[PDB]
């Protein structure tokens, strides 16, 4: 039972960074594995997933 959300508002240039995504995600979104991935529109965005046992 977890949740996820994408914020296109964020800079795509950061997508290249793997430690930057989760850093900005786990920061505000308090996610756990915040990372970016190609969307259905071939658009690269940073998605944040928040899960709590």
UniProtKB/Swiss-Prot annotation:
Disulfide bond entries: 3-51, 15-36, 21-46, 25-48
Subcellular location: Secreted
Source species, domain of life: Eukaryota
One GO process term, biological-process aspect: defense response to bacterium
GO cellular component: extracellular region
Chief location category: secreted
Keyword entries, A-Z: Antibiotic, Antimicrobial, Disulfide bond, Fungicide, Pyrrolidone carboxylic acid, Secreted, Taste-modifying protein
Role: Taste-modifying protein; sweet-tasting. It is 2000 sweeter than sucrose on a molar basis. Has a pH-specific antimicrobial activity against bacteria (B.subtilis, E.coli and S.aureus) and the fungus C.albicans.
Quaternary state and interactors: Monomer.
The family this protein is said to belong to: Belongs to the DEFL family.
Protein name (record): Defensin-like protein
Lineage, top ranks: Eukaryota, Viridiplantae, Streptophyta, Embryophyta, Tracheophyta
